[PDB]
Design an enzyme around this catalytic site. Structure first.
Site, PDB file in Angstrom:
ATOM      1  N   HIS A 218      73.122  -8.526  19.681  1.00 45.52           N
ATOM      2  CA  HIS A 218      72.054  -7.813  19.603  1.00 45.52           C
ATOM      3  C   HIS A 218      73.370  -6.861  21.019  1.00 45.52           C
ATOM      4  O   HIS A 218      72.719  -6.811  21.874  1.00 45.52           O
ATOM      5  CB  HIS A 218      71.612  -7.446  19.811  1.00 45.52           C
ATOM      6  CG  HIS A 218      70.305  -5.968  20.348  1.00 45.52           C
ATOM      7  ND1 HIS A 218      69.895  -5.703  20.936  1.00 45.52           N
ATOM      8  CD2 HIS A 218      70.452  -5.448  19.399  1.00 45.52           C
ATOM      9  CE1 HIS A 218      69.723  -3.993  21.306  1.00 45.52           C
ATOM     10  NE2 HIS A 218      69.733  -3.890  19.979  1.00 45.52           N
ATOM     11  N   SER A 219      74.631  -6.210  20.403  1.00 42.97           N
ATOM     12  CA  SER A 219      75.475  -5.929  21.678  1.00 42.97           C
ATOM     13  C   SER A 219      76.512  -6.785  22.313  1.00 42.97           C
ATOM     14  O   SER A 219      75.834  -7.988  21.854  1.00 42.97           O
ATOM     15  CB  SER A 219      75.154  -4.334  22.336  1.00 42.97           C
ATOM     16  OG  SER A 219      74.229  -4.537  23.394  1.00 42.97           O
ATOM     17  N   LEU A 220      76.419  -6.649  23.691  1.00 45.28           N
ATOM     18  CA  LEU A 220      76.366  -7.922  24.531  1.00 45.28           C
ATOM     19  C   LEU A 220      76.561  -9.265  24.456  1.00 45.28           C
ATOM     20  O   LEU A 220      77.357 -10.325  23.997  1.00 45.28           O
ATOM     21  CB  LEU A 220      75.787  -7.657  25.566  1.00 45.28           C
ATOM     22  CG  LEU A 220      76.731  -8.579  27.228  1.00 45.28           C
ATOM     23  CD1 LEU A 220      78.092  -8.032  27.447  1.00 45.28           C
ATOM     24  CD2 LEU A 220      75.300  -7.731  28.022  1.00 45.28           C
TER      25      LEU A 220
END
Length: 349
Positions: free
Chosen positions: A91-93
């Protein structure tokens, strides 16, 4: 039951991340491998965890390297239990860690992307942005946000994270609260990610990550990208964890609910992050027939007890995990006078 690893991203940082889990050998020893990747840049992640402070929770280069590093250690702990995953989602990063857990990324190559990803973005001296988690359908956003306040994180079917100008957000929430809508801010330390604001940073960051990630390794079919529409999952981009793929992650939207669609119905989902941010989202967007398990809770008196707790939970789930892998072997044969076992094995008579 399928084992699904979920790697939460930012907003996750807090003062004291895994100072408690440092005692566990497999953890420390992974956190030190990170220091070794980061030595040539003169930076020691263990010092970053131990000299934490609001300022460093806000530094986006301390925050990127802190998260990614801890996640990578958590994943190591999980492998210690003898627990490889069936499915993977970032989830992103997060996706940084994921590509480590998918094996297309080195520990070093990982820890060093987080670092540059963070660095270029900080030096690009972008303009004051800010993110927030807001309970509105992805579509209820496109229809209702002030201009220049994009949707950027698609979490549940009815919870999305909007990104945009810091000024713009403040007065759009004094304006949203008043209606009784869901608004939890998120710690970005001023930067609006997964928006257009990043296009500025795309060129210089890409060129630099191209030097860290030579050469690209294949991503496996086990890892569902959340930076690339399910459409072009067989693409040239989506095929390798390349520099190019890394920059894309930071620029595109995080198609999370999208990917969560693919998680089976008897599955157990573990959130691998210094804080269980996606507990809200996962428990809602996913079946009520799936168990959802945090690894660390922020501000907890002692993550050692809390992680073990949840490893216990992983057992009560039905997964095959074994706590003996966390601590040093035991010298077998057992000491004489060590308690019988047979007598305590009761049945359904």
């Amino acid at each position: 039951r399928p084992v699904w690893f979920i790697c939460s991203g930012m907003g996750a940082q807090w003062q004291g991340m895994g100072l408690s889990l440092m005692r566990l050998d497999r953890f420390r020893d992974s956190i030190l491998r990170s220091d070794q990747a980061l030595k040539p840049l003169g930076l020691r992640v263990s010092d970053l965890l131990l000299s934490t402070d609001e300022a460093v929770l806000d530094d986006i280069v301390s925050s990127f390297v802190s998260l990614t590093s801890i996640q990578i250690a958590l994943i190591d702990l999980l492998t210690s239990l003898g627990l490889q995953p069936d499915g993977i989602i970032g989830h992103s990063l997060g996706e940084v860690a994921c590509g480590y857990a998918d094996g297309c990324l080195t520990q070093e190559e990982a820890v060093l992307s987080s670092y540059w990803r963070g660095y270029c973005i900080k030096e690009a001296n972008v303009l004051p942005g800010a993110m927030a988690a807001v309970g509105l359908s992805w579509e209820e956003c496109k229809q209702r946000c002030p201009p220049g306040i994009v949707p950027a994180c698609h979490n549940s079917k009815d919870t999305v994270t909007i990104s945009g100008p810091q000024a713009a957000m403040s007065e759009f929430l004094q304006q949203l609260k008043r209606e009784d809508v869901f608004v939890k801010e998120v710690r970005t330390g001023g930067i609006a990610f997964h928006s257009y604001f990043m296009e500025s940073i795309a060129p210089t960051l890409l060129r630099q990550l191209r030097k860290v990630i030579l050469d690209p390794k294949p991503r496996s079919k086990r890892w569902l990208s959340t930076s690339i529409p399910e459409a072009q999952w067989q693409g040239s981009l989506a095929r390798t964890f390349s520099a190019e793929y890394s920059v894309n992650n930071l620029v595109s939207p995080v198609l999370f609910q999208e990917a969560l669609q693919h998680v089976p119905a008897h599955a157990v989902v573990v959130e691998i992050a210094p804080h269980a941010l996606l507990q809200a989202v996962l428990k809602r967007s996913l079946e009520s027939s799936c168990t959802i398990i945090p690894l660390m809770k922020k501000d907890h008196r002692d993550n050692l007890e809390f992680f073990l707790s949840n490893v216990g939970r992983l057992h009560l789930a039905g997964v095959s995990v074994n706590p003996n892998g966390l601590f040093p072997p035991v010298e077998f044969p057992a000491p004489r006078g060590t308690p019988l076992i047979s007598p305590h094995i009761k049945w359904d008579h």
